[PDB]
Amino acid sequence: MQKGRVKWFNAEKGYGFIEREGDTDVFVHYTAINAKGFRTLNEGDIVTFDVEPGRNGKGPQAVNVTVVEPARR
Numbered sequence: 001m002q003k004g005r006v007k008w009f010n011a012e013k014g015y016g017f018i019e020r021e022g023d024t025d026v027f028v029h030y031t032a033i034n035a036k037g038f039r040t041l042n043e044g045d046i047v048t049f050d051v052e053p054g055r056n057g058k059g060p061q062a063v064n065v066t067v068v069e070p071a072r073r
Contacts, residue, residue: 001048001049001050001064002020002026002048002049002050002051003046003047003048003049003068004018004019004020004021004026004046004047004049005018005019005044005045005046005047006018006019006028006041006042006043006044006045006046006047006071007019007025007043008043009028009040009041009042009043009045011040014029014030014031014040015027015028015029015030015058016028016041016043017058017059018041018047018049018062018065024059024060025059026049026051026059026060026061026062027054027056027058027059027060027061027062028041028047028049028061028062028065029056029061032049032061032062032063032064032065033065033066034064034065034066036066036067037067038067038070041065041067042070042071042073043071044071044072044073045067045068045069045070045071046067046068046069047062047065047066047067047068048065048066048068049062049063049064049065049066050062050063050064051063
């Protein structure tokens with residue numbers, strides 16, 4: 001799969017973007033976040049995820065998203 005760093009996540013609106021090294025940002029919707037304790041992401045979180053075709057049209061879209069390191073804000 002892929003890892004990345006969350007660039008921004010609007011907790012109110014339920015979506016954000018994950019930055020990838022040398023690659024385009026990936027859109028992430030809250031429905032894509034695995035049930036492992038966190039219902040949101042925070043800027044700075046390290047995450048793992050896959051990418052698959054999606055319906056959203058905000059760039060490539062992440063699925064199966066899991067926090068690795070929550071942000072050390």
